[PDB]
Write a protein that binds this ligand. Structure first.
Ligand SMILES: *C(=C)C1=C(C)[C@@H](Cc2[nH]c(/C=C3N=C(/C=C4\NC(=O)[C@H](C)[C@H]4CC)C(C)=C\3CCC(=O)O)c(CCC(=O)O)c2C)NC1=O
Ligand SMILES: *C(=C)C1=C(C)[C@@H](Cc2[nH]c(/C=C3N=C(/C=C4\NC(=O)[C@H](C)[C@H]4CC)C(C)=C\3CCC(=O)O)c(CCC(=O)O)c2C)NC1=O
Ligand SMILES: *C(=C)C1=C(C)[C@@H](Cc2[nH]c(/C=C3N=C(/C=C4\NC(=O)[C@H](C)[C@H]4CC)C(C)=C\3CCC(=O)O)c(CCC(=O)O)c2C)NC1=O
Ligand SMILES: *[C@@H](C)[C@H]1/C(=C/C2=NC(=C\c3[nH]c(C[C@H]4NC(=O)C(C=C)=C4C)c(C)c3CCC(=O)O)/C(CCC(=O)O)=C2C)NC(=O)[C@@H]1C
Ligand SMILES: *[C@H](C)[C@H]1/C(=C/C2=NC(=C\c3[nH]c(C[C@H]4NC(=O)C(C=C)=C4C)c(C)c3CCC(=O)O)/C(CCC(=O)O)=C2C)NC(=O)[C@@H]1C
Ligand SMILES: *[C@H](C)[C@H]1/C(=C/C2=NC(=C\c3[nH]c(C[C@H]4NC(=O)C(C=C)=C4C)c(C)c3CCC(=O)O)/C(CCC(=O)O)=C2C)NC(=O)[C@@H]1C
Ligand SMILES: *[C@H](C)[C@H]1/C(=C/C2=NC(=C\c3[nH]c(C[C@H]4NC(=O)C(C=C)=C4C)c(C)c3CCC(=O)O)/C(CCC(=O)O)=C2C)NC(=O)[C@@H]1C
Ligand SMILES: *[C@H](C)[C@H]1/C(=C/C2=NC(=C\c3[nH]c(C[C@H]4NC(=O)C(C=C)=C4C)c(C)c3CCC(=O)O)/C(CCC(=O)O)=C2C)NC(=O)[C@@H]1C
Ligand SMILES: *[C@H](C)[C@H]1/C(=C/C2=NC(=C\c3[nH]c(C[C@H]4NC(=O)C(C=C)=C4C)c(C)c3CCC(=O)O)/C(CCC(=O)O)=C2C)NC(=O)[C@@H]1C
Ligand SMILES: C=CC1=C(C)[C@@H](Cc2[nH]c(/C=C3N=C(/C=C4\NC(=O)[C@H](C)[C@H]4CC)C(C)=C\3CCC(=O)O)c(CCC(=O)O)c2C)NC1=O
Ligand SMILES: C=CC1=C(C)[C@@H](Cc2[nH]c(/C=C3N=C(/C=C4\NC(=O)[C@H](C)[C@H]4CC)C(C)=C\3CCC(=O)O)c(CCC(=O)O)c2C)NC1=O
Ligand SMILES: C=CC1=C(C)[C@@H](Cc2[nH]c(/C=C3N=C(/C=C4\NC(=O)[C@H](C)[C@H]4CC)C(C)=C\3CCC(=O)O)c(CCC(=O)O)c2C)NC1=O
Ligand SMILES: CCC1=C(C)/C(=C/C2=NC(=C\c3[nH]c(/C=C4\NC(=O)[C@H](C)[C@H]4CC)c(C)c3CCC(=O)O)/C(CCC(=O)O)=C2C)NC1=O
Lengths: 161, 177, 249, 160, 103, 177, 177, 177
C-alpha cells in the first residue's frame, strides 16, 4: 500500500538514499496531476451506480450468462456482480488517487483469479465488464483523466487474466 | 493433431473470447491454403496402412540380409517393432505437413533417434532406404500420380505440398544418418 | 484488336461492356464496315444522346443501378487512378466477362473516386518498403484475421437468435395487453421532462438508450463486425501492393 | 492444456468440483492420424468448429474422484460433463475409460481431483462428425421439379 | 543487406521451363514458380487486433508481490555523508515481499 | 435470360432431343398452376415499399454500429443508397418468381456482388441478415399469414411457391457470403 | 467366468458379508428387467451375420490400404479371417451383454488379443474402427432405430442396455489399442 | 528463330514462343544434331522434379548439419529457398544445352551469384556439392543409363552432348567458388 509520493520514499530509502533531483523530479510530476485526480475521483464517486449500470448493460448482459444456466442467472448471483463490479470501480479510484497500483494487487488481485476459478466465475466476461466499465469512465472524467483511471482498469484486467 | 490450426471461441465464460488477447496470426494464415493442405494429409493417412507395408518390404526385397538369421528383423518382436517405427514416423511427418513446420517432427520423433539406433544395433544405412521409399511414395499421392490408386479431388495444383513433404522426409533421414 | 474494342466503351460511352453478348456484337459491326462503321456505332446511339446529348464531353459514368452488376467492377478496372494512362497496358476484359478471372477488390478501389470519410482509411501509402516474402506474409495474415473474426461474429448472431427465443413467449404475451401510461402522449397532462426527452439524454445514436437483452447483444455485434470490416481492407492494400510487386516485376 | 485454453473448456475444469480427468498425452493426440479416426476428427481442425471441440473435450471430465485403487475389479459407468455416459472399467489392473487404456495411474490435483493419462482420445458415443463446408446448391430449373412431383392422378395409378 | 542489384526485379523468373507437347515445338514459358513459402518474420505491417485485449501482467518479483518493493531494483541517487560500511556481508537478499520500508 | 420453358429446352438441346410427350405432362401442370404464380407475385409487388423499410430498419435493430459515426447506414447519402439496394434485390427476386427460373437473378444481380461490396466498404454480413428479413416477409405474403395485412385470395395451397421464393433468397445470401 | 449374479457375490466376498437386502435390490431390479435384456440380445443375434459384413466392409471403404497388396485384408484367407474375428468378437460381446458382466469379455476374447495383433502384424488402428462400427449398430438395434430393419418390440425404454453394450465394445477397443 | 527464344529469355517479352511446324524444320536444320539435342533436353526437363529432390536432399544426406538448429536448411523458408535455387540452375543449364552456348546462363543467372551467396551466409561448398549431383544425373539421363528409369529413344549416340552438359555444370561451380 504505497502511493506515488510513498513509492519514492522506498526507492530513495530502501537502499538508504536521500531525495535527489531525480526523486523529486517524479514527485513534482505527481503534484502537477494532483488537481486532475481529485476531480476524477470526485465525479466517479457521484456516478458510481450509474457507471456500473452502464457497463453491465453495455457488455455482459447481452450474453446468455444472464439467462438460465449462465453464470449470473440467480438474483443472488446477479447481485454479487454489481457488488463485485463496485470494488473494481472503487479500488481503481484509489489507484488513480494514490498514483500507484500497489493497492490493487495487495487488496484485489491476490487470490482473485484463483478464487473465480473456484467459484467457476468466467474470467472472460469479467474482463469485458471492466473494459466496458473503463469505457464509460473515460466518458465522465475526460480524456487524460480517463487515461489515468483507465491505466488501472487494465492493470486489474491484466492480473485477473 | 488438433493443435495444428487455430479455431475461434464465441461463447461466454471462456476466458479466450474476451481476455485472451491474441488470435493466432501464424495459424489464422494457414487455413488460407488449408483446404489444399487437408486434402494432402488425407492422401497420406488414407494410404498410410499401405505405405508402411510397402516401404518396409521394399527394403527387405532390396536387402535380403535383414530377414536373415542374425539380421535385425528376424525375430517377431523385431519385425513388429520395425513396422511400428515406420508408422510412427509417417504420423509425425503427417503432423508436420499439417502444421506446416517441422518443429513437431524434430521434437517428438527425431530428437535422440540416431543415438537410439546405434545403441540398439539398428542399421542406419538400410533404415534411410525405408524412409526414402516413403519419400517417393508420398509425392505420388499428393500430386495424384500414383499408379494403382487415384483419388478424386478438386481441380488445381498441389506442387509445393509434395515438395513440402519431401522436405520433411530427408530431414528424418539426415537426423538418423 | 482486343484492346481497341475495350477502350471504345470507355472513351466514348463511358462504361464497360455490359456482357460478352454486347461486345461480340461490335466485332460484327467491325466485320461489316471496318473502323468508321464501328466508331459511328457509339455516337449514333440512343444511349449516347440521352446521356451526353450534343453538348457534353463524354465521361466515365458513376450511376447507381447497373443492369449487370459485373459491369461496375469492370469500369473501375478500366478507368483506374487519376495519374494512370492507357499506354502499353495489357488487355483486361475478356476473362472477367466470361467469368474466368474475378476482378480483385483492390483494382476497383483504384477506379472509384475518393471520398473524404471512410470507416477504415487506407494504408495505400503507409505500407513500408519490405520484400516480396514479407509482404506476401503481410497479406496472408490479413485474410487470416478475417477468418477467425468471421466465426466469432457468427457465434454472436446465434446468441442474438437465442436471446429473442428466450423472450418471445412474453414479447407476444405483452403485445395484447392494455399498457396505458400516466403521461407522455397527450399534451393535456403535465409530463415534465418527457414532453420529448430532456437535455442531452438522447445519446450519440438513438439505439443506445434502449435497454434489453437483444439490444445488448446487438452492440456486441457492432463492435465485432466493425473490426471485421476494417481488417477486410487491410488485406486489400496488402494485395494491391502485391499487384505492383508483380506488375512492375 | 492448449486445446482447453482455446476451446474455453478450461474454465470448466478450473472449478473446485471433484473431477477425474482423463487427459490424453500428446502421443495420443499424435495418434489421431489413424486413417479411421481422421475421418471423424479432422473436421474439428477448421476454425469455426469449436462447437464440437468442447463436446469432445468435455467427454474427458468425470464428476467424482475415481482413483485407480477405487476401481478394484469394478465396472461403473457415468456420464461426463458433456452429457453422455462413459464406462470406467478397472479389471486385472487395466483401468479403462471408453477406449482409453490409461497409461499413468493417477495424479493428485488441487481440489481433490485426479488426473489419469490415457493412450487415445475418447470420442463421445452419439457424436457425428461435422460435415465439411460445402456449396449451397440451387435447383437449375423449375420445370424439372414439377415433373419430379407425383400428381394425384399418378398416386391412384390413373397414369403411368 | 540488399546488395542484389545484380539480381534485379526480374529475379526468379525461370525462363527455361520447356513443354514439348509431342514431336512439335518446344513451347518455352516464363513462369515464376514460387516455393512452399511462409516468409517468417514477426511484427507485421498493421495491427490485426480486435479489442478483445487485456493480456498485460507485470513481472514476478519473487515472493513479495509484483511491482513489489524492489526499491532494490529501482534507481535512486544519493547516499548521505555519515554512512560508514559494514563488517559482515550476508549477501544480496530478495524483495522482502511483505512489509515495504513503509510497513 | 431464361424462363421455366427455356430451361427445359436447353436440357433437351444438350441431347438433341425433341420435347416429347412424357415431359409435356409436367409442363401442363406448370401452366395449370400459373394463376397461383401471378396471384403470388401480386402479393409481393403490392407490399414492396414496406418490405424494404421493415428490412433495412430491422437490420439496424440488430446492428447499432451502422448508425454510429463512420457507419454504413450513417449519413443521408448512405441510407438512401442502401434503401435503393434493398429494393433492387426485391426486384430481381420477383422477376425470377414471375419467370419461374432464377437465371435473371444469378447473372444480372448476384454475379460479382460480393467483391463489389468489399470495395465500397459495405459490410456483407449485414446484407445477409437484411435480405433474410425480406425472405420471411415474402413467405408470409405468399401464404397470407402476415399479421397486419391480409389479402383476399381463392382457397387452396401455395406452399410450393413459398419455398420457391425462399430458395431465391438463400441464393442471394450464398453469393454475398 | 462371471455374470451379473456372481459379480456381487465376489464383491460381497471381499467384505466377507452375506448377500443382504441392500444388494438384492441391485439383483431384483436386474431380473425385473430380464425380459428387456433378452429382447436386447435378440436384436443382435438376429442380425449377427449381416452386421459383421456391414462393419468389416466399412473398415475397407474408410481404410483402403488393407485390400492393397502388402496389406492385411488382401488374400482370401486374410479376408475370411477378418470376417471371423468381427463375429468372434461379436460372439463374446453377446455373451457379455447376456451375462451382465464383462468377465467373459476380459478372459476369453481379450485374453492377450493385443499380444496377438502385434505378433500377427494386424493393424490395430483398423480393428478399433471395426469393433466400433458394431458398437454403432448395436445401439441402433437395441433402441430399434436402425434405418433399414425395424423389429416389433413392446414399447418402453432401452437406454440402459444400449449404454451397457456401448461399454462392452469400448472395453474391447481399450484393450486392443 | 533463335532470337524469338532469346526475346522471351533476354528481352523479357512474349512468354511462350512455341515453335509451330514450318518453323521447326528450319530450327532443326540450323541446330547441329538437333534430333539428338531435342531429345537431350527432353531427358532432363521431364525428370526435373525428381532431379532437384535428390540433389537438395543428397546435399543434406552428405552434410547433415545444415538442418541442425543453426544450420541454413533449417527454418522452412530457407529450406524451400534452397530448393528453388536448385531448380533454377537445373533449368538454366538446359537452356544452355538447348541454345548451345553458356552466354545466356552466365549473365542472367550466374553473374553476381558469388557475391550473393556470401551476402546471405550460404555455405558455398555445399552448393558445389549440390550441382555435382545434378552433374551426375544429367549425364545419366541423356545417355539413357539412368537406374530406375529408361527412356524410349531413337537409337544412336549422345556422348558428345553429354560432354557438353558436363561443360555447363562446372561453370556454375567455377563461379560460386
Ligand atoms: C521388392 C523388390 C519391391 C517392392 C515390395 C516394391 C516396393 C516399392 N514401391 C516403390 C514405389 C511406390 N510404391 C507406391 C505404393 C503404393 N502404390 C499403390 O498403388 C499402393 C497404394 C501402395 C502400395 C500398397 C507408390 C505410389 C510408388 C511410386 C511409384 C508408383 O507410382 O507406383 C518403391 C520405390 C521405387 C522407386 O522409388 O523408384 C519400392 C521399393 N518395389 C520393389 O522393387
Ligand atoms: C426494431 C424496432 C425492429 C425489428 C426487430 C424489426 C422486426 C422484424 N420484423 C420482421 C418481419 C416482418 N416485417 C413485415 C412487414 C410488414 N408487415 C406488414 O403487414 C406491412 C405490409 C409491412 C410493413 C410496411 C412482415 C410481413 C414480417 C413477417 C412477420 C409476420 O408474419 O408479420 C422480422 C424478420 C425475422 C427474421 O430475421 O427472419 C424482424 C426482425 N423491425 C423493426 O423495426
Ligand atoms: C463404406 C464407405 C461404408 C459402408 C459399407 C457403410 C457401413 C456402415 N454402416 C454403418 C451403420 C449401420 N450399419 C448397419 C448394418 C446393417 N444394416 C442392416 O440392417 C444389416 C443388419 C446390416 C447390413 C447387411 C446398421 C443397422 C447401422 C445403423 C443405422 C441403420 O439404421 O442402418 C456404419 C457406422 C456409421 C458410420 O460411420 O457411417 C458404417 C461404417 N457406411 C460406409 O460409410
Ligand atoms: C397462393 C399464392 C395463394 C392463393 C392462390 C390462388 N389463386 C387462385 C386463383 C386466382 N388468382 C387470380 C388473379 C391473378 N391472375 C391474374 O391474371 C392476375 C393479375 C393480372 C392475378 C393477381 C385469378 C384470375 C385466379 C383464378 C384462376 C382460376 O380459378 O382458374 C387459386 C385458385 C386455384 C387455382 O387458380 O389454381 C389459388 C389457390 N390462394 C391462397 O389461398 C394462397 C394464399
Ligand atoms: C524398422 C524399419 C527398423 C528397425 C526398427 C526397430 N526399432 C526397435 C526399437 C525402438 N525403436 C524406437 C524408435 C521409435 N519409437 C518411438 O517411440 C519413436 C518416436 C516417437 C520412434 C522412431 C525406440 C524408442 C525403440 C526401443 C523401444 C521399443 O522397443 O520400441 C527395434 C527393437 C530392437 C530390439 O528389441 O532388439 C527394431 C527392430 N530396426 C531395423 O533394423 C529397421 C531398420
Ligand atoms: C492437393 C493434394 C490436391 C487438391 C487439393 C485441392 N482441394 C481443394 C478444395 C477443397 N478440399 C476440400 C477437402 C478438405 N477441406 C477440409 O476442410 C477437409 C476435412 C475436413 C478436407 C479433406 C474442401 C472442402 C475444398 C473446398 C471445395 C470447394 O470449395 O471447391 C482445391 C481448390 C481450392 C484451392 O485451391 O484452394 C484444391 C486444388 N486438388 C488436387 O488436384 C490435388 C491433387
Ligand atoms: C540422345 C539424347 C539420345 C538419342 C537421340 C536421337 N534422336 C534421334 C532422332 C529423333 N529424335 C527425335 C525427338 C526429338 N526430335 C524432334 O524433332 C523433337 C520435337 C518435335 C524431339 C523431342 C525424333 C522424333 C527422331 C526421329 C526418330 C524417327 O525417325 O522415328 C537420333 C537419330 C539421329 C538424328 O536424327 O539426329 C538420335 C541419336 N538417341 C540415343 O541413342 C540417345 C540416348
Ligand atoms: C479383421 C477385422 C482384422 C484382421 C484379422 C486377421 N486375423 C487373422 C488371424 C487371427 N485372427 C484372430 C482373431 C480371433 N480369433 C480368436 O480366437 C479370438 C478370441 C479369442 C479372436 C478375436 C486370431 C487369434 C488369429 C491367429 C489365428 C491363426 O491364424 O492361427 C488374420 C490372418 C493371419 C494369418 O493367416 O496368418 C487376419 C487378416 N486383420 C485385419 O486387417 C483386420 C483389422
Ligand atoms: C540451396 C541448395 C543453397 C542455399 C540457398 C539459399 N538461397 C537463398 C536466397 C537466394 N538465392 C538467390 C539466387 C538464385 N535466385 C534466383 O532468382 C537466381 C537466378 C535466376 C538464383 C541463382 C537469390 C536471388 C536469393 C534471394 C536473396 C534476396 O532476396 O535478397 C536462401 C535464403 C536466405 C535466407 O532467407 O536466409 C537460401 C537458404 N543455401 C544453402 O544452404 C544451400 C547450400
Ligand atoms: C445489379 C444490382 C445492383 C446492386 C445490388 C447494387 C449494388 C451497389 N451498391 C452500391 C452502393 C452502396 N451500397 C450501400 C449498401 C449498404 N450499406 C449498408 O449498411 C447495408 C449493409 C447495405 C445495403 C442496405 C451503400 C451505403 C452504398 C453507398 C456507399 C457510400 O457512399 O457510403 C453501388 C455503387 C453505386 C455507386 O455509387 O455508383 C453498387 C453497384 N447496385 C446495382 O446496380
Ligand atoms: C426366450 C426368449 C425370450 C425373449 C426374446 C424375450 C421376449 C420378451 N420381451 C419382453 C418385453 C419387453 N421388451 C422390451 C424391450 C424393448 N422394447 C422397446 O421398445 C425397445 C426397442 C426394446 C429395448 C431393448 C420392453 C420395453 C418390454 C416390456 C417391459 C418389460 O418386459 O420390462 C417380454 C415380456 C412381455 C411379453 O410377454 O411379451 C418377453 C417375454 N424374453 C424371453 O424369454
Ligand atoms: C525423377 C526420377 C529420378 C530420380 C529419383 C533420380 C535417380 C538417380 N539418382 C542418381 C544419382 C544420385 N542420386 C542421389 C540422391 C540420393 N541418394 C542418396 O544418397 C539418397 C538416398 C538420395 C537423397 C535422398 C545422389 C546423392 C546421387 C549421386 C550423385 C553423385 O555422383 O554424387 C542418378 C544418376 C545415375 C546415372 O546417371 O547413371 C539417377 C538416375 N534420377 C531421376 O531422374
Ligand atoms: C429468476 C429470478 C430472476 C429475475 C427476476 C431476473 C431479472 C432480470 N430482469 C432484467 C431486465 C429488465 N426487467 C425489466 C422489468 C420491469 N419493468 C417494469 O416496468 C416492471 C416494474 C418490471 C417487470 C414486472 C426491464 C424494463 C428490463 C430491461 C432494463 C433495461 O433494458 O435497461 C435482466 C437483464 C436482461 C436479462 O438478462 O433478462 C435480468 C437478468 N433474473 C433472474 O434470474
Amino acid at each position: 500500500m504505497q502511493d506515488a509520493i510513498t513509492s519514492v520514499i522506498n526507492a530513495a530509502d530502501v537502499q538508504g538514499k536521500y531525495l535527489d533531483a531525480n526523486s523529486v523530479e517524479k514527485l513534482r510530476g505527481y503534484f502537477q496531476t494532483g488537481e486532475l485526480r481529485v476531480r476524477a475521483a470526485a465525479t466517479i464517486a457521484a456516478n458510481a451506480a450509474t457507471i456500473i449500470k452502464e457497463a453491465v448493460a453495455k457488455s455482459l448482459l447481452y450474453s446468455d450468462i444472464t439467462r438460465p444456466g449462465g453464470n449470473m442467472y440467480t438474483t443472488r448471483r446477479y447481485a454479487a456482480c454489481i457488488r463485485d463490479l463496485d470494488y473494481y470501480l472503487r479500488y481503481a479510484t484509489y489507484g488513480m488517487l494514490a498514483g500507484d497500483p500497489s493497492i490493487l494487487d495487495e487488496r484485489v488481485l491476490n487470490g482473485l483469479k484463483e478464487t473465480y476459478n473456484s467459484l467457476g466465475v468466467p474470467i472472460g466476461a469479467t474482463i469485458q465488464a471492466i473494459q466496458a466499465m473503463k469505457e464509460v469512465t473515460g466518458s465522465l472524467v475526460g480524456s487524460d483523466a480517463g487515461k489515468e483511471m483507465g491505466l488501472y482498469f487494465d492493470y486489474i484486467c491484466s492480473g485477473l487474466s | 493433431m488438433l493443435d495444428a490450426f487455430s479455431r475461434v471461441v464465441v461463447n461466454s465464460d471462456a476466458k479466450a473470447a474476451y481476455v485472451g488477447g491474441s488470435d493466432l496470426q501464424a495459424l489464422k494464415s494457414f487455413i488460407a491454403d488449408g483446404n489444399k493442405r487437408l486434402d494432402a494429409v488425407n492422401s497420406i493417412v488414407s494410404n498410410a496402412s499401405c505405405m508402411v507395408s510397402d516401404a518396409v518390404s521394399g527394403m527387405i526385397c532390396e536387402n535380403p540380409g535383414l530377414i536373415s538369421p542374425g539380421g535385425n528383423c528376424y525375430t517377431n518382436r523385431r519385425m513388429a517393432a520395425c513396422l511400428r517405427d515406420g508408422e510412427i514416423i509417417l504420423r509425425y511427418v503427417s503432423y508436420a505437413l499439417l502444421a506446416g513446420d517441422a518443429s513437431v517432427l524434430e521434437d517428438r520423433c527425431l530428437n535422440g533417434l540416431k543415438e537410439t539406433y546405434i545403441a540398439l544395433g539398428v542399421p542406419t544405412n538400410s533404415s534411410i532406404r525405408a524412409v526414402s521409399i516413403m519419400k517417393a511414395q508420398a509425392v505420388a499421392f499428393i500430386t495424384n500420380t500414383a499408379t494403382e490408386r487415384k483419388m478424386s479431388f478438386a481441380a488445381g495444383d498441389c506442387t509445393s505440398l509434395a515438395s513440402e513433404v519431401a522436405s520433411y522426409f530427408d530431414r528424418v533421414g539426415a537426423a538418423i544418418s | 484488336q482486343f484492346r481497341f474494342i475495350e477502350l471504345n466503351f470507355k472513351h466514348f460511352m463511358g462504361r464497360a461492356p455490359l456482357d460478352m453478348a454486347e461486345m461480340s456484337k461490335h466485332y460484327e459491326i467491325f466485320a461489316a464496315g471496318g473502323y468508321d462503321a464501328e466508331v459511328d456505332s457509339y455516337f449514333d446511339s440512343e444511349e449516347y444522346l440521352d446521356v451526353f446529348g450534343l453538348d457534353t464531353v463524354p465521361y466515365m459514368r458513376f450511376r447507381g443501378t447497373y443492369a449487370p452488376n459485373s459491369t461496375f467492377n469492370l469500369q473501375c478496372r478500366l478507368q483506374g487512378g487519376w495519374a494512370r494512362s492507357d499506354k502499353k497496358l495489357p488487355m483486361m476484359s475478356m476473362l472477367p466477362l466470361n467469368n474466368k478471372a474475378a476482378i480483385m477488390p483492390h483494382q476497383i478501389v483504384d477506379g472509384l473516386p475518393v471520398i473524404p470519410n471512410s470507416e477504415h482509411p487506407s494504408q495505400k501509402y503507409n505500407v513500408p518498403k519490405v520484400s516480396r516474402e514479407k509482404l506476401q506474409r503481410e497479406l496472408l495474415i490479413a485474410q487470416g484475421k478475417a477468418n477467425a473474426l468471421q466465426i466469432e461474429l457468427d457465434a454472436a448472431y446465434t446468441s442474438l437468435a437465442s436471446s429473442r427465443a428466450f423472450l418471445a413467449p412474453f414479447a407476444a404475451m405483452a403485445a395484447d395487453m392494455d399498457i396505458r401510461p400516466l403521461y407522455g402522449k397527450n399534451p393535456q397532462v403535465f409530463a415534465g421532462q418527457f414532453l420529448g426527452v430532456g437535455a442531452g439524454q438522447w445519446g450519440k445514436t438513438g439505439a443506445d438508450t434502449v435497454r434489453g437483452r437483444s439490444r445488448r447483444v446487438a452492440a456486441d455485434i457492432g463492435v465485432k463486425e466493425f473490426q471485421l470490416e476494417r481488417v477486410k481492407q487491410l488485406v486489400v492494400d496488402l494485395q494491391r501492393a502485391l499487384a505492383l510487386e508483380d506488375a512492375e516485376a | 492444456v492448449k486445446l482447453l485454453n482455446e476451446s474455453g473448456v478450461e474454465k470448466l475444469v478450473e472449478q473446485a468440483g471433484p473431477y477425474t480427468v482423463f487427459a490424453p498425452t500428446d502421443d495420443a493426440f499424435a495418434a489421431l492420424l489413424e486413417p479411421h479416426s481422421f475421418n471423424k476428427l479432422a473436421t474439428l481442425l477448421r476454425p469455426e468448429n469449436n462447437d464440437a471441440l468442447r463436446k469432445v473435450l468435455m467427454h474427458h471430465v468425470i464428476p467424482g474422484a475415481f482413483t485407480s485403487a477405487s476401481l478394484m475389479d469394478r465396472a461403473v459407468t457415468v456420464k461426463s460433463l458433456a452429457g453422455e455416459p462413459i464406462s470406467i472399467m478397472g479389471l486385472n489392473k487395466l483401468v479403462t475409460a471408453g477406449t482409453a487404456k490409461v497409461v499413468r495411474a493417477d495424479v493428485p490435483c488441487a481440489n481433490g481431483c485426479i488426473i489419469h493419462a490415457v493412450s487415445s482420445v475418447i470420442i463421445p458415443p452419439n457424436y457425428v462428425p461435422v460435415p465439411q463446408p460445402t456449396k449451397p446448391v440451387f435447383p437449375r430449373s423449375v420445370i424439372a421439379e414439377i415433373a419430379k412431383l407425383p400428381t394425384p392422378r399418378q398416386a391412384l395409378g390413373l397414369d403411368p | 543487406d540488399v546488395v542484389n542489384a545484380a539480381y534485379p526485379k526480374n529475379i526468379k523468373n525461370k525462363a527455361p521451363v520447356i513443354s514439348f507437347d509431342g514431336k512439335k515445338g518446344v513451347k518455352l514459358e516464363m513462369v515464376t514458380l514460387q516455393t512452399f513459402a511462409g516468409d517468417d518474420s514477426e511484427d507485421t505491417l498493421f495491427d490485426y487486433s480486435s479489442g478483445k485485449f487485456m493480456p498485460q501482467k507485470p513481472a514476478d518479483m519473487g515472493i513479495a508481490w509484483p511491482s513489489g518493493d524492489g526499491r532494490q531494483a529501482e534507481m535512486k541517487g544519493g547516499k548521505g555523508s555519515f554512512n560508514q560500511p559494514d563488517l559482515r556481508k550476508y549477501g544480496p537478499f530478495p524483495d522482502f515481499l511483505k512489509r515495504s520500508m513503509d510497513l
